Structure formats: structure tokens, C-alpha cells
């Protein structure tokens, strides 16, 4: 004899239906908009006669049950746990079941895997017809229930400024099953006060949102202050249910669709250099069937001191032709989609969550893929013995110095750009010949894709 | 200039020197065309590319009219013209076809500004209507031999169709025992004539138009759709066995097609709700098929 | 009038020597039917190299050993020893492909046949091109 | 380094892309609801396999650009100009491009042509597959832009009582082109204060709206006090864009549809003689397939003394 | 691995040793297949269940391209390759077919990563475009004899189609008198060749590919759709009578197909608004049919 | 029905040539139809994404075609 | 035809394994393909079972080659039950999708070899694939 209120609901995400412990189940902090259920299909058989005194009667049959629908919203709350000292988001298994179809392994390098610097999610291993399989456990007041064999259909993230960073999850399950007995003690599995304090120490505010967009075909970075946006991770999962005329049926298995990583970004038109107006004019002047943009949406902002942040990186993105949104202040919309280099390659994009992002950390996350792996920032090329010039028929094996000293990729390539008076090899052994009386240049760039420039103008002469 | 709208038209059938303007016309469709003799005389001398085409005949036209039932029962003249014998307001299907050639009549399709298309040597070749839960309408099909464009015409000011008859649910009986669970009673009557092409060498360099035709056969048919209903286990009245001879009548408040003796074939479909379908034709020695036309109050 | 097929992709087997032999045949279409006579490979030498990329400055993975088997029959063999196969296997891309984890991309290769002599013109000719793949083996 | 506000937009209507003068371009006084833009089409190519370890990847291609959409609302503001002393509406070339497909000639007798008494627009010469061709020039603050080769699709007029007489224009253009340099000095071409005073002297109030309806088959004039209404001039213009798989395409030409002049008029039922009730009862008693009515909607009212009216 | 997208493709036609890359391609469709000889040798000894199927021939491919008109008029080469004689920018339909065999050419369908499909021994068998209220486009239809997969190919960097021509309303004239109320002018040109199968016993245990073909006929045709419009009562210019010989031209701002003498057959449809339909073919002794290709400014 | 996929330039495994005899099996977790020797004919369609279509019949001397029915756990 | 070197071996737990390869040389010049068997002279086969293809992978086991009936071409590859147990020890705990008894144990390939039959070491790989252990119940 009791009424059940929605405010007392508690959600646990599990990968096992028995043997529930702290590594298989954790509570998911949900909000008011939580919803779940399961709909049923039916049919009416009616006789349609034409004569006088016709039969006017119907009949209903239950024929099938639809896939269970569930949805809830959670705050993006990166933090570091005391047990492992690795940055982790509380709803990490949700990210894993969204990202890959293999067993969860935070020590690995695919799907949801963490580190001593940041928590990372990449979609390099999502080529599966059935992604990682969860079981949502619902606790309303006293009664228990759960959805059997769920799959993460999508994860909506709305960049709504003057609001907190939040993600909305949606999915489907085979069947919603009400449980009379307690599966596991929610007091122990549920998050305790210490980790709650640690989490609430780190919040992501959508207002402090910087965006980094670069045209890979022209090497043009734009300065676009955002007004509002959203990006989605969608699986297009469809649940199959068998058709049996004699008995009602529930869905039996599913099949993932096409993985889509789209987005939409609204901003005001700026007349300044490399502003929104320049991007819009370039996009509507080129009129190209395909675009290669690098988009790095950085929720929570970038700062020298440690700040929480959630970052979406699209290496090779596709940007639609923008349109002007006539409001009281003129604006625009930059709708993009992260496409892979090859269809069966994955790597459409990745995400990095942490409560400790210095600007260098997010920079090397963007250019190297991991916040811990350092990346080169600047280069000044060095000759063989501090030499400033060269004469005809003389070698010059030039070297390189890089910063920082702990960058993972310390190598560079070699090229000649301005002038035709010398040639360089893979190692850097520049070679010249006679009849070389012009000023020639030499260049070097790193192999990690940082975008670092090494230049030197050597004054090659005809000799004494 | 003057465009020609179908909605702004008037169809008048000219028979016996009187114009039967068939109002209450839901929709009609017609076409005109010519026959060509196109041969390509490719020779070893000249493998030509240009054909030798001459227009020498008018392809017979196929005009279809959809006419609502009316209180003045002008539409029964289509049965009258198609060959049925008349007694009062009831049309009989004769045991034998009366004449070799059908009853020929001309038809006009009037339009504004003295525009007209004149179909000649027409005969009614098909009449079928479905008694159903929608308003009944009989689609007549006539075939013409010669079409022409004329300036003045015949317009049926007086002979016209009255108000459309109100809907009334159909019911099919055996003697006086109703047949339960009716769905759609469709009746079909035909005069399957054939054109006698007599294009000869005296018509060379001239356009030929069909003029004479002969009746291959007349028939009355009906397809009845029911729901498979049984009242008893091993019922005798309602089953799937064929019925060599049984009196049938597809009755309405304004029309009643009577088969004094009928040959019924049944067909069961295992659809969402089981449906049986009849195929009613009159027997060999059956009395003439009746078609009564009741205007109002029977 | 038909097309050539200069682009050929080679697949080597790890821990196993790779041997490819090419036959050059003279052809002609005339009143009499297609007459084919083997091309006499005298002063004809081959030379092939493999790099991990097309772009300038690419690391040279290895180089092919060239030999002429039969000049009269116009047969030349282009191959590499097992040690070179291991060298290329070490330098191959680590990215695997599902449905066949064996094959990995090793780089691009070219073959030039040349005839160098005092009376001979300094003429080279890129007979083929394409990419080199590796079928990883476990034995040895 | 500046933000652009919608309130500083100024719209000029032109028939020429060069040699802009006061007879080819004039400013059009627009309102808050002004809007313009151009949308683009795309496509996603996705592989749909069935086996285990399926490929889950998509790809987007820009394939075509849609026709540019523009719309704005203007007040019906008849007046007489000092230069020609003939009554003219400031957005007269819009009316011309709506009415006829020939070159503008106010001295003529078809399309938009004026007089010493009134400005008139008739649709006696709109039998053209491509009506008079305009170029909308948009000036937001400092930056310029324009829509190339526009056509007046329709003109919505809403008879909303207790409101001012207003007309809403809509149309399509081949392509929206942003201009970096000033095409013409907006100070000179834009309307000056004298003509602004002359215009604001004349306003059309939708409240003072008399309607004159007469059944031509019976010679019966009705007295119907209106409650609210609207009439439209529609061209049903459709813009054609070519389909090329290798390159994105913009519309190349258009074709006018069927010219429709419809309307809708709401009024209360009156029991008086020749009222709304009589018209309704006559119309539902006759039940005729075709009607011949004479309708003369007079915005601004009729008076013995001089008053503005449309 | 490498998937093959239709949108990421390039179609190059190889003729006379030069590559004609046909850009401005709206859509193309093609298929490849093989012919089998599958017999089941059921005997009284063994009533077997396993057939004896051997692949011995390549079924000819049917490639269809839809190409937009362009300012450089590369698309007129399809008329040139199909057999029309050329003078300036106008293509004539010759009185007689010039040669027994059609003009053969090869075609490539390029894709990324050196992937290609090589159609050989192709000939243009159909070209038809509809001048209407939508942007004109000519659908060409070629038939191949042998298809193959090749690594390197021919890519038409220079010879390419320019910008698509802007739309312009069609208009059909008689001499210089316009024909009112045009709806859709559709033109059709064909080279109805036939493959000469010469599969013999020397091709046993081998895959056979068609190589040679002969031209059965060439023709130029056009179907014109109008609205039935009459300006006078009993008009002589506009009616339904056939016209043995009349000069016709279906003109546009960029193309004009001319019939010096035409054989017109008319067909009236009593639709919502009456429509007449013409069937225009050149006469026996008519001068060659003209097809002019105006890029810009005529 | 497959998608036209090639892994190499001038590939030998995946192409359009007919295969007189090749062992094929269309396998599932609960059923597996086996052709000990199959006659495969290929057909390429230049659709939105290129698709190849096979036509698999057993050869003349092929062993009997298998159809396994696995209820659960094979 | 083409190439079919890739075939997967399913070895049984607690049972010794032995495979019998009838080497053959079919030629389809004549319509009834020639059934000539290759003659096994100066031939040795070598095969190791190694988990994963990455370099430095531990050698799970090694095949034991047997050459018998050289005239008619047949040959045998086998390994003792102790080798089977060593293979089954290191097999992964994840089971195959189609059969819940098999577990991936590693990769393999056998390499034929001619040792100076004509002063040439003409060694090429015969077959390849994955080795699957099938869990037994008897022991």
C-alpha cells in the first residue's frame, strides 16, 4: 500500500544478470526527464458487409510487443578515482557500450579506455552487429525492475550556453521485466559521499565553449565564437521481432545500423579576420562536393590552470554549405558530419574527458589522439656545425631541435620549397652542384601532424 | 483561343433521330487515332533510312462512359440498344441473338464554341455495374467506326437523366431465402461484337472507316463476393459444392437482376476473414435473365 | 588500341623467398596472324626499389635483386631473398584488416628496365608499378 | 571586427547589375519580418551489410544548391512624386515584375503603369515563361550582398482590421552572392526626407474597408461589413536546377506556373436586406457549378474628400 | 577495403585514341553478366539432380548514360558516333546508312584506387531527349560486347563537358508559324544494330565475347504533345486530319531539330483538358533531318 | 548478394570471373547450407554502391548438398 | 579454383591429432582433369602454432611432419596428445560463435621445401589459418 514517486528513482547499469559487484554495476545519476517503458501492438478484425442488417462487430488480438524504450540525461562529470588514480567518467560503461562491441577493458586502446591524464572514447572498434550489451536496472522507491539486454542507441549532447554540460542517452531493450526481489544492495553499489564530493568538484559549463575549426585543404584556422550547438553519436540500431499469429512475441536480437557522428553549430557573423563571415563566404564561393575540415569542439574551455573539459575531435569532417539565420543579430549555422577516411576504418572521431586539462594537454589530445602523449610545439632547424651558408658542390647535413623535449614523435621530414639550387634526401644530407647562384630554402615538418614549421634561408653563393 | 475542358462538355447519343443527352455522367474517356502502313524499303542499292508511311484507315475508337442511375431510367436504353428485349420496365436477355448486326447509333461530345467530336457507327459492347456499399454506377463501353469534327450538332434539351437515385443496400436471394454476409455484387453484361474489315483495293489512296459488324455472342454474368459463413456443422445450404441449377436474384430497391436458373461456382480465399466468391451464369435451358428498373416506389 | 596494365600489386609471403619472372615478347598484327618472337635481353638490366610512401623523402624499405634468366627466350626474373622479405615485414604498417589479418601494406614499388651502352641511347622505361603487400607467417 | 544587426538592413530593387541610377534602383522600406537565404542539399551513402563485423561508416556529398528564398513586408503607400506629378507606389517595380514580363513602361497600358489620377496594375500581359527580372540588393550595416536574377513569386495582402494596409512579398533567386564592394551609394539612391514626408502623409488603414460584391447573374448588390480577409497574387514559379553528380549545381532558369488570384473574406451574419445571410442563403440555394460575381475590395474606404486607398 | 561509390566515378569514352571524359553526367546505369549452358542429364539409369552448367559466353552489356547539355557540345559526338554526317555544328541524318557495321569505341568507368571496368566494342544505339518545362537531358544507350577489369586506364583530363546550358523554353514551328499550346516535345534517334553471334566449335572451353555487328536501320522520330486548341469553327490549320508532308522544326535557344518534310499523325485524348499528340517522322523523299547544336549566342 | 569490394589492384580472390568449382558454405548460428563444390556466376550492378550478385548451384560431380539444423549450442 | 590455402583446424581436447594430406596435381587442359599425383622427393614440411601474428609471439606448439607413400603423393602432419594438451592450456577462454566448444588457440602454416633437388631451396607455404581447440568431456 504505497504510491511511487519519480524523484526516488535510481538507475544502475550492468553487464551481468548475476554476480553484481562494483566493477559490473554502477549507479547513473539521472535527472527529471528520465523515462522508460514498453508498448504493445494489436489489431482489430472487422467484418465489412454491404447488405441490409449487416454485422457490426469487431475483435482485438494482441500480436506483438515493441522494443522497450528508455532515456535519461546525465551530467558530464569527469574525475579521478582514488582506487586506480585514472581519470574516469561515472557513466563509463555507457560510453563503452556506445563506442565498441567488445568486452570492456580500460587498460586497452579502443572504445572507452582511461589514463592517468584523461578518459578517452574512440570508435575504432565498433564494427559489430551487436555492441557491448548492458542491463539497465531501475529502482523506484521500493519495487525493482530492469530492462533485459539493452543497447545504447545514441547519445545526445546539447551545447546550450548558460547551462551545464549534459548528455542525453537513448536506447532499446528486449523486454522490461519487473523484479520482486532485490538484485543487489543499492546502498553499497550506489555512489558514496566521498566520490560525490569529488564529482561535484568538477563540472563542465557549456558557456565556456571554444571551438577549433581548420580547413585541411587550405590550412586556415577560423575564430568562431559559438552561440549554441549540438552533436550526436548515433548507431541507428533496429530491433527485430518475430511475427507469430498464435502467440505474442518480444524482440529477439538486434542489428546496428550506420554509425553517424553529426553536429550543428550556430554563431554570429563576424567581419573580423578569419571570422564567421570569412568561413561562410569561403564555403559558398568554393562550392565543393566534399570538404576536409578539422573540428575540435572543446566544452568547458581551455585554460593554463587545470579545468574540467569534454572534447569532441573530428579529424576529417564534412561541413555543409552554411546559411544565414536572420535574427535580431545576424548569424549562421555550421552543420557538420565526421566522416572516416575509409568506410571500414572507423576513426570518425574520438572524445577526451578529464578534470585536469591544461592547454598543452588538449592540444596534444587533438594532434596526437591522447592527452598523455606530448606533441611538438615549435622547431628551429640546425645545420651541421652552426653553418650559415654554402658554396657550390658542398654538402650540408642539417639537423633539428624540437620542443618539448619529451614529445613522442621527434622526427621530421625534409623538403625544398623556395629556389632550385640544392636537393635533400630522407636523412637530410643536402647536396648542391655548380651554377647555383641563388638563395635556396629548406623546410621540415613533424610526422605527428602537429603543424610545426622548421624554416631556414641558406645563402648559397657561387663560391670564392 | 478556345481550350476544351472535359468538365465543360455534354454527351448526346443520337438514336432513331432523337437526342438522348446523358446527364448525371460521372466520367467518360475516349480517344481517336489513325492506322498507318509504314514499310522501310532497304535495298542493296540504297540502304535507306526513310520509311514509306501512308495513313489509310481510322482506328476504331473505344469510348467508355460512367453513368449514375437516374429516376427517369434513360440508362436502360443502353440495355435496349445492346440487344435486350423490352417488356414494360424490365429487360430480358433473349434466348438467341435477334439480329446478326448490332444496333448502330451516333454519338456527339459537345463543347463550347460550336466544337464537337462526332462518333459514328457506334454500338454498346459492355455494361457492368457493382452493387456494393458505394453508390452504384454502370460503366458502358461503346466502340465507334468513324470519328469526325463537326460544327453543328444534336443537343438533347428534353431527353435527359433526372436526379440520381438514393443509395440502397444490395441483397441477394435464393427464391426468398436471403444469402448472408454479402460484400460486393458485381454484374456484367456484354455484346461481344466484331468489326468486319472490308478494306479493299478500291480504297487505295483513301482513308477507310469501319462500318459493319456482327454479334459473336451476348451473355449475362455476375460475380458475388461473400464471407465464408456456416451455421451448422456439415451444413448443406452453405458449402463449397457447385450448384448446377438454382434460382438467384441480386435485388436492390431500384434494380433487380434475376437468374431463373443459375450455375454457381464457388471459390474460397483464406484471407484475414475467409471469403467465398461465386461465379453466376445462367444455365443452358434457363429462362431469360431479367433486369428490372424501378424508378421510385418500385 | 587496348589498354595496358602497368599497375600490378604484389603479395609476398613472410619467411619465404619471393620470386617473380617477366617475359618480354615482340608482337605484331598483320595479314599473317599474330607473330610473337621473344625479345633478346642483351644489355638489358632491371632495378627496383620499395618505399613506404609515394611522397618525396620516403624511407626506402628495401630494394629488389635483378637477374636475367634466358636472353634467347626473353625471360627476366625480378625477386628478393628471404632476408629482404623479413626486412620489409619489419617495416610494414602495423594496421591489420579484418577477414584476413595476414595482409599488411608494405609500400610502393617500381621497376625500370634500361639499356646502357656507348652506342645505346640513354633510355629508361618504367615497366610496372603498384603496391607491395605482406602475408605474415608464423613459422620461422 | 563588428556584429551585424537586422535593424540596419536596407533593401534595393534593381533591374540591372550595373549602371545603377534612380530609375533602375529604389530602396524598399521593409519591416522586422524580412528574411533571406539559400539552402543546400546533400546525401549520405551508407553501407548496409548483414554479416558479423559489418562496416559501419557513412559519407556525405554536397550535390546541389536550392533556389534562394527571400521575403519581406512593406506598407501600401501611394503618393504623387514631384518629378512626374503622377501617382506612384514606392515599390512599383515589384508590382511590375509581379504583373507582366515586359520591360517596365509606366507610360503604357499593361502591367504597372501610372497616371495623373492613380497608379494601376493589371495582369493583361503576363503570358511569359519568365516575368520581368529583378535583382534584390541587401545592405546590412556595412557589408553588401545581393540575390541574382530574382522573380516575384507572390504578393500576400492581409486585410487585418485595426492594422495598417500592408503587403508581403515572396520570391526566389538563382543564387545569393555576397558583395565586398559597394555597388551604388545607398545615400543617393535611398529615399530622402522630402519623399518620406510625402509618403507618411498617405497611409492605408485596413479598418476602413468597404466591400462591393454583386451577382452578375441576378444583379444583386450586397452590403457585407467585413471582419477580416486576405487576397493573394500567386505565380507558382518553380526554379529548375540541373543534376550533376561530379559538381554542385545552382538553379539555371525558371518557369512561371498558373497565375492565381484568390481571396478569403470573413464577415458576420446580418439579417438585414441584402446582408451576409441573404448572400449565404442564395449561394446555398442555387447550388451552381459556376458563379459570376463582381468583387471590388476597397482598402482604405471611400469618401467624398480625398483619401488614400488600394 | 575499397568500396566503389557511383558518385565517386568518372566515365571516359575512348575513341580514335583520345579520351572523351563526359562530365555533367546526371546518372548512369550498367550491368555485366555471363551466359551459361545448363542442361540436366536425367537418365533411366540415374535420375540425377545435379546440372551440367558451363560458362561459355559474356552476355552483352547495356549501358545507359544521362548527360546534361554543355557549352562545349561534346555530347554531339554521340550523334557523330551513331552515324550522322557532320557539317559545322549541325548533324545530318543520311539518306542511306553509310557503312554496314557501326562505329565501335571503348569506354571506361573509372573509380578510386586504380579500379576500373573496361567496356569494349561499344556502339551508340539510342539517343532521346525531351524538350519540356524541365531541364533537357539526353539519355544515350550503348551496347558492349566485352567487359573487363583493368588496372590502368584512359582519363580525359582535357576533353570534358563545360557548364550546363541554361534552360530555355521549347517551341515548335511550321515554316515560321508557331504551333500553339505546346506541352512536351520528345525527340528520339536510334541506330538499331544487331549482334552477329559467331560462336563456333573452335570456341569450346573458352569464354566468347561478341565482336562484330551490323546496322539494321537508322531513324529520327519525335512525339509532340499539345493541347487541343481551335481558333475557328471548322478550322483548316489546326485539326485532326493527317499531314502527308509539312515542314516542321522543334526549336530551342540551343538546339533545333529540323524535319524538311514530315509525316504527322494526330491522336486526341479526352482528358481533363483535351490533348492532341503528334507522331512526326520524316517522309520518304524528305531532305536529311537537321540537328543543330548552338553553344551560346546561336 | 555482396558489395563490390576489392582489396588489391588486379585481385585474384575477388573478381568477376566465373568459378567452375569452389567449396562454399552459407553459415549461421543455427543453420548451415553446404555446397561441397559450387558453380558461381557473378553479376555486377553499378548502383549507388556497387553490388555483385552470385548464382550458386552445385556442380555435376559435387557431393550431396548439406543442410544442418542446429537447435541450440550447435 | 583460385587460392584456398586458408583452412582452419579444429583439434580435439584429450585426443591425439593427425591429418592426412593427399597431395595432388590437377590440370584442366583436358576436360576430365588429370589426376596425376605429385611425387614426394626431397620434400620436408615445417609448421609451428604461434598465438597471434605479432613479432616475438610465443610458440604454442610445433607440428610433427610425416612423409609416407612418396610415390602416390600423400603425406601426414600430426602432433602428440601432449602437444594437444599444451595447445589447450594456452587457448583463450572466449568460445567461437558458431560452435560453443571451439576456442581460438593460435595461428599456423606449413611450408613445403625442396632442399637442393636442383641446387634450389624452393620452399613455399602450403596452407594457413587458425587452430581451434574443441573442449572434451571424456577426460
Overall geometry of chain C comes to elongated
**Overall SS class of chain C:** mainly beta
Number of helices of chain B: 1
Quaternary organisation of the protein chains: part of a larger assembly
Helix content of chain C: under 10%
Q: What's the shape of chain B?
A: globular
Detailed description of the structure:
Chain F: It is found in: Virion. Chain F: Homotrimer. Forms a pseudo-hexameric ring. Interacts with collar protein p132, DTP-pb9 and tail tube protein pb6. Chain F: Forms the simplified baseplate, together with the p132 collar protein ring and the cone (DTP-pb9 and BHP-pb3). Chain F: It comes from Escherichia phage T5. This is part of a larger assembly, with two copies of chain A, three copies of chain B and two copies of chain C. Chain A contains five helices and 33 strands. Chain A has helices at about 90-100, 185-190, 195-200, 275-285, 360-370, and strands at about 10-15, 25-30, 35, 40-45, 60-65, 70-75, 80, 85-90, 110-115, 120, 135-140, 145-160, 165-175, 175-180, 210-215, 220, 225-235, 240, 255, 260-270, 295-300, 310-320, 325, 330-340, 350-355, 380, 390, 395, 400-405, 410-415, 430, 440-445, 455-460. Chain A has a 19-stranded antiparallel sheet that branches. In chain A, a hairpin with a 2-residue loop joins strand 11 and strand 12 (about 145-160). The longest helix of chain A is centred in the middle third of the chain and has 11 residues, at about 275-285. Chain B is an all-beta fold. Helices cover about 0% and strands about 50% of the residues of chain B. Chain B has one helix spanning about 75-80, and strands spanning about 10-15, 20, 25-30, 30-40, 50-60, 60-70, 85, 90, 105-110, 115-130, 135-145, 145-150, 170-175, 175-180, 180-195, 215-225, 245-250, 255-270, 275-280, 290-295. Chain B has an 18-stranded antiparallel sheet that branches. A two-stranded antiparallel sheet of chain B has the order 4-5. The longest helix of chain B is centred in the N-terminal third of the chain and has 6 residues, at about 75-80. Chain C is mostly beta strands and about 140 residues long. In chain C, the strands form three sheets. Chain C has a five-stranded mixed sheet. Chain C has a three-stranded antiparallel sheet with strand order 2-8-7. In chain C, strands 3-4 form a two-stranded antiparallel ribbon. The interface between A and D is large, with 45 and 43 residues.
Amino acid at each position: 500500500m504505497s504510491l511511487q514517486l519519480l524523484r526516488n528513482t535510481r538507475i544502475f547499469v550492468s553487464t551481468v544478470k548475476t554476480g553484481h559487484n562494483k566493477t559490473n554495476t554502477q549507479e547513473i545519476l539521472v535527472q527529471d526527464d528520465i523515462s522508460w517503458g514498453q508498448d504493445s501492438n494489436s489489431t482489430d478484425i472487422t467484418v465489412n458487409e454491404a447488405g441490409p442488417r449487416p454485422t457490426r462487430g469487431s475483435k482485438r488480438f494482441n500480436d506483438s510487443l515493441n522494443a522497450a524504450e528508455w532515456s535519461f540525461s546525465t551530467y558530464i562529470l569527469p574525475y579521478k578515482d582514488k582506487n586506480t588514480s585514472k581519470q574516469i567518467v561515472p557513466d563509463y560503461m555507457l560510453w563503452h557500450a556506445l563506442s565498441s562491441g567488445r568486452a570492456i577493458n580500460l587498460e586497452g586502446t579502443t572504445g572507452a579506455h582511461n589514463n592517468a591524464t584523461n578518459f578517452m572514447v574512440n570508435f575504432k572498434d565498433n564494427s559489430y552487429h551487436e555492441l557491448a550489451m548492458l542491463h539497465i536496472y531501475i529502482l523506484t522507491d521500493k519495487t525493482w525492475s530492469y530492462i533485459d539486454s539493452c543497447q545504447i542507441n545514441q547519445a545526445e549532447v546539447n551545447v546550450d550556453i548558460e547551462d551545464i554540460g549534459r548528455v542525453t542517452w537513448s536506447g532499446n531493450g528486449n523486454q522490461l521485466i519487473p523484479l520482486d526481489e532485490q538484485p543487489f544492495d543499492p546502498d553499497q553499489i550506489g555512489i558514496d559521499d566521498e566520490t560525490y564530493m569529488t564529482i561535484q568538484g568538477s563540472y563542465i559549463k557549456n558557456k565556456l565553449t571554444i571551438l577549433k575549426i581548420k580547413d585541411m585543404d587550405t590550412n586556415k584556422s577560423y575564430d568562431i565564437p559559438i552561440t549554441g550547438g549540438t552533436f550526436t553519436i548515433n548507431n541507428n540500431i533496429t530491433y527485430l521481432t518475430p511475427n507469430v499469429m498464435s502467440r505474442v512475441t518480444i524482440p529477439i536480437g538486434s542489428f546496428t545500423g550506420a554509425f553517424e557522428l553529426t553536429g550543428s553549430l550556430t554563431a554570429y557573423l563576424n567581419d573580423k579576420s578569419l571570422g564567421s563571415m570569412e568561413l561562410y563566404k569561403d564555403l559558398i564561393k568554393t562550392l565543393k562536393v566534399v570538404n576536409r575540415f578539422e573540428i575540435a569542439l572543446v566544452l568547458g574551455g581551455e585554460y593554463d590552470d587545470e579545468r574540467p573539459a569534454a572534447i569532441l575531435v573530428a579529424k576529417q569532417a564534412h561541413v555543409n554549405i552554411p546559411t544565414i539565420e536572420t535574427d535580431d543579430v545576424l548569424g549562421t549555422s555550421v552543420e557538420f558530419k565526421a566522416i572516416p577516411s575509409d568506410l571500414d576504418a572507423g576513426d570518425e572521431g574520438y572524445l577526451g574527458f578529464s578534470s585536469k586539462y591544461t592547454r598543452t594537454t588538449i592540444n596534444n589530445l587533438i594532434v596526437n589522439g591522447d592527452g598523455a602523449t606530448d606533441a611538438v610545439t615549435a622547431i628551429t632547424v640546425k645545420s651541421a656545425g652552426n653553418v650559415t651558408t654554402l658554396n657550390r658542390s658542398a654538402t650540408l647535413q642539417m639537423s633539428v631541435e624540437v620542443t618539448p623535449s619529451s614529445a613522442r614523435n621527434k622526427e621530421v621530414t625534409w623538403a625544398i620549397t623556395a629556389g632550385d639550387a640544392a636537393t635533400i634526401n630522407a636523412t637530410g644530407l643536402l647536396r648542391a652542384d655548380a651554377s647555383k647562384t641563388g638563395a635556396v630554402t629548406v623546410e621540415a615538418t613533424a610526422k605527428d601532424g602537429s603543424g610545426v614549421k622548421g624554416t631556414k634561408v641558406i645563402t648559397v653563393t657561387a663560391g670564392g | 483561343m478556345f481550350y476544351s475542358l472535359m468538365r465543360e462538355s455534354k454527351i448526346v447519343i443520337e438514336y432513331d433521330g432523337r437526342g438522348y443527352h446523358f446527364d448525371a455522367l460521372s466520367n467518360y474517356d475516349a480517344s481517336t487515332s489513325f492506322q498507318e502502313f509504314k514499310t522501310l524499303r532497304r535495298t542493296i542499292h540504297n540502304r535507306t533510312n526513310y520509311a514509306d508511311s501512308i495513313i489509310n484507315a481510322q482506328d476504331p475508337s473505344s469510348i467508355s462512359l460512367a453513368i449514375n442511375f437516374s429516376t427517369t431510367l434513360i440508362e436502360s436504353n443502353f440495355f435496349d440498344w445492346m440487344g435486350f428485349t423490352r417488356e414494360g420496365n424490365s429487360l430480358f436477355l433473349p434466348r438467341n441473338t435477334p439480329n446478326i448486326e448490332p444496333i448502330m447509333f451516333n454519338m456527339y461530345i459537345i463543347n463550347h464554341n460550336n466544337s464537337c467530336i462526332y462518333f459514328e457507327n457506334c454500338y454498346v459492347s459492355t455494361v457492368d455495374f457493382s452493387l456494393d456499399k458505394s453508390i452504384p454506377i454502370l460503366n458502358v463501353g461503346i466502340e465507334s467506326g468513324k470519328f469526325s469534327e463537326v460544327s453543328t450538332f444534336r443537343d438533347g434539351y428534353t431527353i435527359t437523366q433526372g436526379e440520381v437515385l438514393p443509395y440502397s443496400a444490395p441483397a441477394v436471394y435464393t427464391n426468398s431465402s436471403p444469402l448472408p454476409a454479402l460484400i460486393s455484387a458485381s454484374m456484367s453484361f456484354q455484346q461481344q461484337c466484331s468489326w468486319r474489315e472490308d478494306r479493299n483495293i478500291f480504297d487505295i489512296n483513301k482513308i477507310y472507316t469501319n462500318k459493319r459488324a456482327y454479334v459473336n455472342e451476348m451473355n449475362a454474368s455476375a460475380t458475388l463476393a461473400f464471407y465464408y459463413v456456416k451455421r451448422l456443422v456439415g451444413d448443406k445450404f452453405l458449402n463449397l459444392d457447385p450448384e448446377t441449377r438454382t434460382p438467384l436474384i441480386i435485388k436492390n430497391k431500384y434494380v433487380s437482376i434475376t437468374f431463373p436458373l443459375a450455375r454457381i461456382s464457388k471459390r474460397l480465399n483464406f484471407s484475414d476473414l475467409y471469403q467465398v466468391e461465386y461465379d453466376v451464369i445462367p444455365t443452358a435451358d434457363s429462362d431469360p435473365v431479367e433486369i428490372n428498373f424501378f424508378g421510385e416506389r418500385k | 588500341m587496348s589498354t595496358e596494365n602497368r599497375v600490378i600489386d604484389l603479395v609476398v609471403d613472410e619467411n619465404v623467398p619471393y620470386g617473380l619472372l617477366m617475359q618480354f615478347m615482340d608482337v605484331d598484327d598483320s595479314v599473317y596472324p599474330s607473330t610473337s618472337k621473344p625479345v633478346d635481353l642483351t644489355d638489358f638490366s632491371l632495378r627496383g626499389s620499395i618505399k613506404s610512401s609515394l611522397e618525396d623523402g620516403a624511407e626506402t624499405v628495401a630494394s629488389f635483386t635483378t637477374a636475367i634468366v634466358d636472353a634467347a627466350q626473353g625471360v627476366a626474373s625480378i625477386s628478393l631473398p628471404v632476408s629482404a622479405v623479413t626486412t620489409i615485414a619489419s617495416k610494414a604498417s602495423k594496421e591489420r584488416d579484418r577477414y584476413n589479418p595476414r595482409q599488411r601494406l608494405a609500400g610502393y614499388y617500381d621497376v625500370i628496365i634500361t639499356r646502357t651502352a656507348v652506342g645505346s641511347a640513354a633510355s629508361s622505361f618504367r615497366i610496372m608499378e603498384g603496391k607491395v603487400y605482406i602475408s605474415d607467417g608464423v613459422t620461422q
